[PDB]
């Protein structure tokens, strides 16, 4: 980070809203009658299937950020939430795996 | 005031009961830290 040279882990695979844009373009091409790269169409279908998974990952990132904000606020009582932190570390290990 | 200290301690005890209901992490350590802080406050009160 800027002023924090340590690698702040954006812990998640590459998420691009352009995938959603391509899915919308595919739906529009279905609506408007255009032949297209059906390999890309199948990839967009798989991406649409995994889009809820991407949303879950984004929500998990938001939850991690909220936990980080809470920790930054109450570092003085971060030990008070030691059990939740341990559960979160276990979940982080599972998600990394 | 002795009654004022009793009221403050009653608030502290209610908070302790709430924390026990919380089921958070590091409960005995937090209790010890709170006891030490109360000791510091009481030491100021004792100097007074």
């Amino acid at each position: 980070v800027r002023g924090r040279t340590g690698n702040v882990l954006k812990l998640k695979v590459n998420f691009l809203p352009e995938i959603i844009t391509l899915s919308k373009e595919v739906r529009n091409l279905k609506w408007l009658g255009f032949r297209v790269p059906l390999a890309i169409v199948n990839k967009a279908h798989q991406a649409n299937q995994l889009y809820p998974f991407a949303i879950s990952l984004i929500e998990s990132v938001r939850t991690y950020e909220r936990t980080c904000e809470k920790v930054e606020e109450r570092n003085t009582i971060s030990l008070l939430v030691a059990g939740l932190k341990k559960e979160v570390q276990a979940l982080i290990a599972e998600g990394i795996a | 005031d002795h009654k004022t200290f009793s009221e403050i301690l009653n608030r502290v005890q209610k908070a302790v009961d709430d924390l026990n209901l919380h089921s958070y992490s590091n409960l005995p350590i937090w209790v010890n830290k709170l006891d030490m802080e109360i000791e510091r406050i009481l030491g100021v009160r004792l100097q007074a």
């Binding site: 702040v8 882990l9 030990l79 932190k85 341990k86 290990a93 990394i96 | 590091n26 005995p28």
Partner: peptide, 28 residues
């Protein structure tokens, strides 16, 4: 009475979590 001795209940630090996670990513 065997007072306390509650294993020093504390979790891995978030920076320590970041370190272990970077280690895993290197292993990944």
């Amino acid at each position: 009475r065997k007072l306390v001795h509650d294993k020093e209940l504390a979790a891995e630090d978030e920076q320590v979590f970041l370190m272990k996670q970077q280690s895993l990513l290197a292993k990944q």
